[PDB]
From Swiss-Prot, chain A:
Ubiquitous. The chain holds residues 118 to 289 of 289 of the full protein. It comes from Homo sapiens. One of its GO terms (cellular component) is nucleus. Residues 1-168 form the PITH domain. This is Thioredoxin-like protein 1. The gene is TXNL1.
Swiss-Prot record, chain B:
This is 26S proteasome non-ATPase regulatory subunit 7. PANTHER family: 26S PROTEASOME NON-ATPASE REGULATORY SUBUNIT 7, EUKARYOTIC TRANSLATION INITIATION FACTOR 3 SUBUNIT F-RELATED. The keyword Acetylation applies. Belongs to the peptidase M67A family. The lineage of its organism: Eukaryota, Metazoa, Chordata, Craniata, Vertebrata. The gene is PSMD7. Keywords: Acetylation, Isopeptide bond, Proteasome, Ubl conjugation.
UniProtKB/Swiss-Prot annotation, chain C:
Residues 10-145 form the MPN domain. Pfam families: JAB, RPN11_C. This is 26S proteasome non-ATPase regulatory subunit 14. Its EC number is 3.4.19.-. The lineage of its organism: Eukaryota, Metazoa, Chordata, Craniata, Vertebrata. Coiled coil: none annotated. A motif (JAMM motif) lies at residues 92-105. It comes from Homo sapiens. One of its GO terms (biological process) is double-strand break repair via homologous recombination. Component of the 19S proteasome regulatory particle complex. The 26S proteasome consists of a 20S core particle (CP) and two 19S regulatory subunits (RP). The regulatory particle is made of a lid composed of 9 subunits including PSMD4, a base containing 6 ATPases and few additional components. Within the complex, PSMD4 interacts with subunit PSMD7 through their respective MPN domain. Interacts with TXNL1. It is an enzyme of class 3 (hydrolase). Keywords: DNA damage, DNA repair, Hydrolase, Metal-binding, Metalloprotease, Phosphoprotein, Protease, Proteasome, Ubl conjugation pathway, Zinc. One of its GO terms (molecular function) is endopeptidase activator activity. The modification Phosphothreonine is found at residue 245. GO terms for cellular component: cytosol; cytosolic proteasome complex; extracellular region; ficolin-1-rich granule lumen; nucleoplasm; nucleus; proteasome accessory complex; proteasome complex.
UniProtKB/Swiss-Prot annotation, chain D:
This is 26S proteasome non-ATPase regulatory subunit 1. Transmembrane segments: none annotated. Belongs to the proteasome subunit S1 family. The chain holds residues 320 to 367 of 953 of the full protein. Disulfide bonds: none annotated. Component of the 19S proteasome regulatory particle complex. The 26S proteasome consists of a 20S core particle (CP) and two 19S regulatory subunits (RP). The regulatory particle is made of a lid composed of 9 subunits, a base containing 6 ATPases and few additional components including PSMD1. Interacts with ADRM1. Interacts with ZFAND1. Component of the 26S proteasome, a multiprotein complex involved in the ATP-dependent degradation of ubiquitinated proteins. This complex plays a key role in the maintenance of protein homeostasis by removing misfolded or damaged proteins, which could impair cellular functions, and by removing proteins whose functions are no longer required. Therefore, the proteasome participates in numerous cellular processes, including cell cycle progression, apoptosis, or DNA damage repair.
Length: 172, 286, 289, 48
């Protein structure tokens, strides 16, 4: 599917940065990042907080927060951007989200793509999704597939730098 | 003791930036940072600052975290960039102090013994002076009362060194008022003063009401100081002063009268000169 | 062929300008430098939010001065506080020299441009920018391979001659020949102007203080004496009323003298000082008992 | 019939055609004025 000129940010997801909260041991975070039946479930409650980190500032167009049709798919999704520190569940509900999204049943299907306000996400470095309920009100929710579609923002990697022209030891 | 804590413009413009950095995404209360600056005889100069990762919890009001290594390493960099700055205190934009201030101040006492916390009310833009500077004193309260930590107050004043002054003056360059004042701005300077004196007197009344209704503790000190201000009133009704006031009011009116006359004769002379001008050109047209 | 439309702006935040000016005056006898943190929001706008000083080193303002360990660590630590901006350019002062880039500066700029084709370079003369004027021109190397095409490769736009004209004290050091200026525009916003307005803001107490009458009476007496002598000339200047081409008389005696300029000009001062003083006097009589 | 004519002329088919037939039939633009401007262009952004 995907829109014209935009690519999935799977290659851009920093495995080091990503961390889920309430993820069950049997079905972990890595499961929901693969295009397989393997999924992620929340152990201690239906609330889940799945954060990701991108290698370089990326832009966001459409995330695909797919979920199982058993009713344990996500229902209400709160997205935050460029969080300086990891989030807390109690403080996550309080804080106002960048885009409060009410997933509809049509979205959870395998082919469903949910559109995000492209204006708000222009320099996202780390996005945290907060699943506040599942469709069936089941004890544990599930994210069948979840990835972000946008474009990469060219970032000036000062780590490389390196002189390209000139001779060393030259002053003003 | 620190007679003054002169906050330079750059700090309150980085704190504002610091508040925006976080509040924009991580909606949270006060943003805490470190305040660098050079010492003086007694007036602490605040010349720069930086942010320190600070997270707090409304529960128990002591589950916080002010990073040590970030504070240590940051200053490790800044003393490299500029060596006249030493850590001198902290800043938080939460308008009302917290229960966590004392404990955290003890921490910043580990980096500067005479640590002064400057509360910058970044959100408000009001009567003025968006900085409030506090110290830490532990005294026996002379007058037989429990001991405690408490934050004593230190006079705060906002000033500017030459370099920032040039930047600031241009930075406004669209709302700055004329330095001359002129009659228009001078009078507004007084409607502004009246509004304040009422506003300050109203804060005094509410507190006096609070102590009057018990909701607050009779300080027993600073309470009678307000009684000092209440005796320092002028008592203008005194005859010998009433005469002496009319003399100076009369002494000035004779100068505004002479000023008024000069401006009138000049006015008439300018109309006569102009009446000749258009009339002479009137005849000369023919 | 991409082109930096002259409409393209390097937005300088109210923070950066004070911090960039502060660094420049910090080491004014020598030359200081630091990296600027911002975002390339799009082609026609290079937004710089924060700047962090790169420590002064003996090299000067050159690629070598950019300590990779200092920059990699500082960036890492500013990312935690909530400023995940990218290195958008570099700035260096020019103790009184002007707003131009020397040969060595050009080589630096070419390096920064290597990482992103829009790394803007600024200057910031802390000695000339001493008053309301702030001499800070932004610059981006105009790659020498575009001599076949149009330099300053702009397109549809009309803000090229606005906000500035090519400064002569720079056009000589290589402009529109190797480095072109980019319009500099400051992103001051409310909640930042208000906090800067406190720099010289007075207070509630001010405006009710009655001056002091001893030097006020002396001042009133002083100005009235000076205006008196100015009336004597006003009488002589008018009572002369010499008509030998009076329109020419009014233009051969213009030296900022008697007739009016040293006249009521003082009346405004004399009358403003008294009215404000009197009004303060009566307000205090009402407010304070 | 006539209403079809009415529709044809209210929509603006006719006006443009007649307005087009006018300007094409009565066109007279002094190309000489452009030439002295095209040759006077210093190859600046005045090419637009
Ligand atoms: Zn230079």
């Amino acid at each position: 599917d995907i829109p014209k000129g935009y690519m999935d940010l799977m290659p851009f997801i920093n495995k080091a940065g990503c961390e889920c909260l309430n993820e069950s041991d049997e079905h972990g975070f890595d499961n929901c990042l693969r295009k397989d039946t393997t999924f992620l479930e929340s152990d201690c409650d239906e609330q889940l907080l799945i954060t990701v980190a991108f290698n370089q500032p990326v832009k966001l167009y459409s995330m695909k927060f797919q979920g199982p049709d058993n009713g344990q798919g996500p229902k209400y999704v709160k997205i935050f951007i460029n969080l300086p520190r990891s989030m807390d569940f109690e403080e996550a509900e309080r804080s106002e989200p960048t885009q409060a999204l009410e997933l509809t049943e049509d979205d959870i299907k395998e082919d469903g793509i949910v559109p995000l306000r492209y204006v708000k996400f222009q320099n996202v470095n780390s996005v945290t999704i907060f699943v506040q309920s599942n469709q069936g009100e089941e004890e544990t929710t599930r994210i069948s597939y979840f990835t972000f579609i946008g474009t990469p923002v060219q970032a000036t990697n000062m780590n490389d730098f390196k002189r390209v022209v000139g001779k060393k030891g030259e002053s003003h | 003791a620190v007679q003054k804590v002169v906050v330079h413009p750059l700090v309150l413009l980085s704190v504002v930036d610091h508040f925006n950095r976080i509040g924009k995404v991580g909606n949270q209360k006060r943003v805490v940072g470190v305040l660098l600056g050079s010492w003086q005889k007694k007036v602490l100069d605040v010349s720069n600052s930086f942010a320190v990762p600070f997270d707090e919890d409304d529960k128990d009001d002591s589950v916080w975290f002010l990073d040590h290594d970030y504070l240590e390493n940051m200053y490790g960099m800044f003393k490299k960039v500029n060596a006249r700055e030493r850590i001198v205190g902290w800043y938080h934009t939460g308008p009302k102090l917290h229960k966590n201030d004392i404990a955290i101040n003890e921490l910043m006492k580990r980096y500067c013994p005479n640590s002064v916390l400057v509360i910058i009310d970044v959100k408000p833009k009001d009567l003025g002076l968006p900085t409030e500077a506090y110290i830490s004193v532990e005294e026996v309260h002379d007058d037989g009362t429990p001991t405690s930590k408490t934050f004593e107050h230190v006079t705060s004043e906002i000033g500017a060194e030459e370099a920032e002054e040039v930047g600031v003056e241009h930075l406004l360059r669209d709302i700055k008022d004329t330095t001359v004042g002129t009659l228009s701005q001078r009078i507004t300077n007084q409607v502004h003063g009246l509004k304040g004196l009422n506003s300050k007197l109203l804060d005094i009344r509410s507190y006096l009401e609070k102590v009057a209704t018990g909701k607050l503790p009779i300080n027993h000190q600073i309470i009678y100081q307000l009684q000092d201000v209440f005796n320092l009133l002028p008592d203008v009704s005194l005859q010998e002063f009433v005469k002496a006031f009319y003399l100076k009011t009369n002494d000035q009116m004779v100068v505004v009268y002479l000023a008024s006359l000069i401006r009138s004769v000049v006015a008439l002379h300018n109309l006569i000169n102009n009446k000749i001008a258009n009339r002479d050109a009137e005849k000369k047209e023919g | 062929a991409p082109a930096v439309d002259t409409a393209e702006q390097v937005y300088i935040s109210s923070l950066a300008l004070l911090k960039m000016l502060k660094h420049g005056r910090a080491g004014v006898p020598m030359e200081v430098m630091g990296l600027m943190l911002g975002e390339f929001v799009d082609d026609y706008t290079v937004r710089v939010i924060d700047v962090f000083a790169m420590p002064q080193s003996g090299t000067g303002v050159s690629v070598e001065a950019v300590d990779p360990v200092f920059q990699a660590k500082m960036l890492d630590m500013l990312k935690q506080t909530g400023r995940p901006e990218m290195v958008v350019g570099w700035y260096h002062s020019h103790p009184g020299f002007g707003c131009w880039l020397s040969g060595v500066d050009i080589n630096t700029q070419q390096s920064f441009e290597a990482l992103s084709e829009r790394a803007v370079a600024v200057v910031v003369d802390p000695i000339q920018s001493v008053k309301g004027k702030v001499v800070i021109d932004a610059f981006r190397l105009i790659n020498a391979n575009m001599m076949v095409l149009g330099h300053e490769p702009r397109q549809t736009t009309s803000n090229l001659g606005h906000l500035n004209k090519p400064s002569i004290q720079a056009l000589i050091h290589g402009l529109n020949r190797h480095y072109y200026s980019i319009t500099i525009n400051y992103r001051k916003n409310e909640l930042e102007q208000k906090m800067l307005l406190n720099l010289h803001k007075k207070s509630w107490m001010e405006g009710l203080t009655l001056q002091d009458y001893s030097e006020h009476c002396k001042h009133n007496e002083s100005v009235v004496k000076e205006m008196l002598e100015l009336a004597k000339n006003y009488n002589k200047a008018v009572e002369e009323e010499d008509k030998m081409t009076p329109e020419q008389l009014a233009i051969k005696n213009v030296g900022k003298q008697d007739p009016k300029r040293h006249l009521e000009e003082h009346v405004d001062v004399l009358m403003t000082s008294n009215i404000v003083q009197c009004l303060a006097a009566m307000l205090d009589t009402v407010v304070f008992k | 019939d006539q209403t079809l004519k009415m529709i044809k002329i209210l929509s603006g088919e006719m006006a443009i055609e007649l307005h087009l037939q006018f300007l094409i039939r009565n066109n007279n633009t002094d190309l000489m004025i452009l030439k002295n401007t095209k040759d006077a262009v210093r190859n600046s952004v005045c090419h637009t």
